[PDB]
Amino acid sequence: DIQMTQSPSSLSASVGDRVTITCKASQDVRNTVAWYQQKPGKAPKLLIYSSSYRNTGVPDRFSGSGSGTDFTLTISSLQAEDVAVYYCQQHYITPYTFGGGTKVEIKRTVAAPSVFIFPPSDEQLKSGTASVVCLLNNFYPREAKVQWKVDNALQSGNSQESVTEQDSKDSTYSLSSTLTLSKADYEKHKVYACEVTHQGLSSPVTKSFNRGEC
Amino acid sequence: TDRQLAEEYLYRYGYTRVASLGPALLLLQKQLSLPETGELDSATLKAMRTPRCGVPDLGRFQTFEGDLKWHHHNITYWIQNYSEDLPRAVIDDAFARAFALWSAVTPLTFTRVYSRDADIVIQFGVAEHGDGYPFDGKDGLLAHAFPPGPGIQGDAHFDDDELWSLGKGQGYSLFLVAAHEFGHALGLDHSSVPEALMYPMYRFTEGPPLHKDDVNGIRHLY
Amino acid sequence: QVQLQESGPGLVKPSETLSLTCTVSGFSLLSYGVHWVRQPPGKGLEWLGVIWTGGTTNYNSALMSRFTISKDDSKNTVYLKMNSLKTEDTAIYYCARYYYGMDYWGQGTLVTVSSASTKGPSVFPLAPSTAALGCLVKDYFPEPVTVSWNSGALTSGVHTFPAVLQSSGLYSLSSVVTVPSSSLGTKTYTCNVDHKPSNTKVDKRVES
Ligand SMILES: [Ca+2]
Ligand SMILES: [Ca+2]
Ligand SMILES: [Zn+2]
User: Fold this and answer.
1) Domain hosting residue A152, numbered range
2) Where Zn(2+) 1 is bound, by residue (chain B)?
3) Helix (H) or strand (E) holding B182
4) Residue B66 Cα to ligand 3 middle (Å)
């Protein structure tokens, strides 16, 4: 088998920067290397073929070079819509092996999250479980601290988060944290708070609600 | 290890499925214009060991798409890679002089492009090279091509396990093999006239590659 | 217009056999090769095999000959049969057309290798200057789940979060959308949840 080694496994750059991904082949693979761009939830897109040829409908900033064992993909001016994982593949000898991917992300200015909290729906409580959801909407950078406070008492191990991939227009992330108590344990308390710490917030933003009302 | 040589030649090029081995050898002797004796004589053995085009003589590789002729006249080709045996400019030119043979007698023009959109894509490769049709190593079959049409069709492939040259000296003439193969890529099948270009066996010639049977064959097409 | 699409059951049981069908349109399997590529969620692509125009195949030796490809050129279909399924075989499977590169790909179909039985979601409204609302698709197996808003109308501001696996063994996700708070009575906002492996669709409207 022929191994294809992509470097780096991820990179973070700014709009306008020039980006360079490499792909080393364990043995001579001639010019038969192709580059794919794959956006989340979507199939890969042929980007470059035969090392250096640009598939139809691919902007001029995408360029490929190389021959033999060492191949390079270059984005000459990275744009916000170029966030994706980029794979290389050789088709000189079966198995037509792939590289391991290179995740390309965007640097941008700090953007504070918009915080919302959603109490459990009545329809759900009519089943014995309550899910309290907290939403951090369109923020940057990705790192954000979300801790739940029920009756000002910090909670732990009864929530779990989920983060979208970087938005292809504004380069922001969005995050949801879901606190799950049982019906009985939900009704033992009053104030349900979601405290959010992030670099664009000078001080923690808290969003709360009182059970027997909202 | 001569009856097995015959069984593989006959199978590969299509005589076996069309057909004792006598009857199949009789189809081959006729199709190659040898003395039709029906025996694995010396002349048939000589022919079976001569280098030649890999395209079958009866039948095809497969069922293809379309009516196997081009329905436009601005034919575009792509030279996808090169052999190390000749300067790129010499290879580019041999393919140009190979296509010129055919334009010289048809309503077709050949324009080089740099895209996998080309109708004819030219590629050098060895053993399994990305079609289902692997080459055989040194000597034996030297190349193959496909009838006109979409995708893999119209393309021409050359066994890079060979030594590619031009005039005399050693190696096979890239100009002559390409000219034969582009015949396949324009719709022609193999001729049975030993001195025609679409004759499947390789013969070095100076002077005109094209023979009466080729220009007549290309004409009932375009 | 070249198109490829994979179809086949998502849930299969360990040690049993999977069959996916790739239905092709816009080109001829007599002229192009067709390849199978898989990708475990969140991981990278692995090449599986190819069936060439003339019908011969080649398979990745890493699949211990469990995997085969056949086609029907007339009906424009390519068939993947993989038996003795292991857990490791859970992935998205793609078929792709190859001509100096895989230029056209299916949309990919997820194949979850599991003994567990399928189970459909429960949809609850996430409901409370910009307002935010959404749906909570809770307790389903296996993946995937499709959420659209206003039957495909509403697109901007929609964020459907990646699924989460829970101690019950069942997935759960949320779709949200930010909207102008003025338009809260003037317009109605409906999420359309689509969990196919259980063959359940649910439309939920969200209000205070
Ligand atoms: Ca072609
Ligand atoms: Ca050969
Ligand atoms: Zn020939």
Assistant:
1) 109-211
2) 129, 131, 144, 157
3) helix B174-185
4) 20
Query: What are the CA-CA distances from residue A123 to residues A63, A183, A214, C121, C136 (Å)?
Result: 54, 12, 14, 14, 12
Residue A7 CA from chain centroid, whole number = 19
Q: Which two tokens stand for residue B84?
A: 């190390």
Please give the Cα distance from B69 to C3 (Å, whole number).
25
Rounded to 10 deg, the angle between the B22-31 and B3-13 helix axes is 60
Q: Rounded distance, CA B115 to CA A58, Å?
A: 13
Active site includes B7?
no
CB contact under 8 A, B117 and A56: yes
Q: Are C31 and B153 in contact (CB under 8 A)?
A: yes
- State the method: X-ray
- Among candidates C97, C96, C46, which has minimal Cα distance to C67? C46
**Residue-wise burial string across B107-142, b where 16 or more C-beta atoms lie within 10 A, e elsewhere:** ebebeeeeebebbbbbbbbeeebbbbbebeeebbbb
Task: Report the gap between the CA of A45 and the closest CA in chain C (Å).
Answer: 7
Angle C85-C87-C91 (CA atoms, 0-180°, nearest 5)? 90
Shortest alpha-carbon distance between residue A208 and chain C (Å) = 11
Nearest CB to A95 within list C47, C105, C160: C47
What the block records as the tokens of A91 is 């088709």
Pairing of strands C33-39, C91-98: antiparallel
Cα Rg of chain A (Å, integer): 23
Selected for mutation to probe chain B from C31, C32, C73 (highest B CB count within 10 Å) is: C31
Q: What is the homologous superfamily of the domain B1-222 according to CATH?
A: Collagenase (Catalytic Domain) (3.40.390.10)
Task: Tell me the chain C residues in contact with residue B55 when contact means C-beta distances shorter than 8 Å.
Answer: none
The CATH number assigned to the domain holding A202 equals 2.60.40.10
Closest CA to A80 of A13, A7, A2: A13
What is the distance of C-alpha A210 from the center of its chain?
A: 33
- Same domain? For A142 and A198 the reply is yes
Subunit contact B130:A50, Cβ cutoff 8 A: no
What is the DSSP-derived secondary structure letter of residue C178?
E
Number of domains chain A contains = 2
**Closest listed ligand to the CA of B183:** 3
Domain(s) labelled CATH 2.60.40.10 in chain C stretch across 118-208
Query: Which phi and psi angles does B6 have, rounded to 5°?
Result: -70, -40
Please identify which of the residues B36, B39, B84, B181 carries the catalytic annotation: B181
| DSSP letters spanning B3-70 | HHHHHHHHHHHTHHHH---HHHHHHHHHHTT----SS--HHHHHHHTS-EE-S-SSS-SS--SSSSS-
Q: Of all helices (H) and strands (E), which one includes residue B88?
A: helix B88-103
Record the tokens describing residue C101, joined without a space.
């590169």
Which CATH class name applies to C118-208? mainly beta
Distance between CA atoms of residues A204 and A145, nearest Å? 9
Is position B151 annotated in a ligand binding site?
yes
Instruction: Copy the structure tokens of residue C165.
Output: 């696996």
Chain B hits for C32, Cβ within 8 Å:
150-152
Residue with the two structure tokens 């021409």: B156
For residue A90, the one-letter residue type is Q
In what helix (H) or strand (E) does residue A67 lie, and over which residues does it extend?
A: strand A62-67
Closest residue of chain C to A56, computed from CA coordinates: C103
Q: How far is the CA of B49 from the centre of ligand 3 (A)?
A: 16
CA distance C176 to C136: 9
Coil, strand, or helix at residue A183? helix
* Contact between residue A99 and residue A5 where contact means Cβ atoms under 8 Å apart: yes
